Design a protein around this nucleic acid. Sequence first.
DNA 1: ATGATCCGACGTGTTAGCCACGCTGACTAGTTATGCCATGCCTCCCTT
DNA 2: AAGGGAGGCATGGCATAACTAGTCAGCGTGGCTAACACGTCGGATCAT
Length: 246
Amino acid sequence: MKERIHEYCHRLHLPVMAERWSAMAEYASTHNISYSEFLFRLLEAEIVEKQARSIQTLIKLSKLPYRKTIDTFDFTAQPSVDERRIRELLTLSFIDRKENILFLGPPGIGKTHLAISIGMEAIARGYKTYFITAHDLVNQLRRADQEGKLEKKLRVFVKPTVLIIDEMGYLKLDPNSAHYLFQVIARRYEHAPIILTSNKSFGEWGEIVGDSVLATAMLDRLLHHSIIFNLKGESYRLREKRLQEE
DNA sequence: ATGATCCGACGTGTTAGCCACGCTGACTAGTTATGCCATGCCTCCCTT
DNA sequence: AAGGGAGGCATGGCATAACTAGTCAGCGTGGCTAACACGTCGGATCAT
Ligand SMILES: Nc1ncnc2c1ncn2[C@@H]1O[C@H](COP(=O)(O)OP(=O)(O)OP(=O)(O)O)[C@@H](O)[C@H]1O
Ligand SMILES: [Mg+2]
């Protein structure tokens, strides 16, 4: 009969339930527990494992290079940013408010770290997330359009609840393809937040995309509902380099 | 029983004349298109 | 990579309105028929 239970558990797609079947049976036998409560505990454990696996699969699907969180961010080394605003962002009220989040400042000041932390927080609370660099997004959209499947990739870039655009400005975008980026900003406008990190000021966006009018339209659509952080201070990579040297 | 030869009949080509079919226009009737709503099937995405 | 679930789009049915096809009549043009002549094919008969 035990083999039948194991086969049924595997067939119903409950691997962990079968794995811990003997342990839970022994626990129930040793200590008297109501059947309802025992099933509640088993289903809760299965749901916890399923949630962990789903979060890991979402992390894999969302191309996050390195996993980080707010807990690992040192506000003392970066006093230019108020921790209160970051904590308010972590509440994910902007998702309901459709507000974007723009990080600006010199390289290595934690912009990417903060963006990844916000993305991880969104993923944990069950919100679909996606991470990509601006150059990669533009190149992928261009390649999809050249294949006559731009709409599919546009859906791919629009479907995520939280889209992260990292390093917008380090590499100049091809003028013939900048519009692709605008499309995303045009379709995610008032629909889903965008977390964009850059080292260039807004006035220079025209240089990045090579079209002043398109850059102005993109900025107007992006900044309509957004929270802008102007981070300052010394580079964290250089700080670590000095600490290692010293 | 088969092949060759000779004879007779039928088919074809040509020309002329006549009759029937095709085209066009008008009018009337019947069928198709379209809009709207509801249901079913196909496709896409996610999970194992 | 395969199966299951969910969502979206396409189809069908029904009702109404409009456009097109059918029919009839008249006129014009093309095809069929008839007659005659000639050539070819089929049938019959005789010989091996
Ligand atoms: N305050 C901080 N606390 C902890 N780690 C930090 C902090 N600031 C930066 N780092 C780490 O330093 C490295 C570079 O920082 P990060 O990429 O977040 O900065 P950035 O401004 O987005 O960089 P860049 O523009 O050069 O790409 C990463 O490992 C990041 O985790
Ligand atoms: Mg960075």
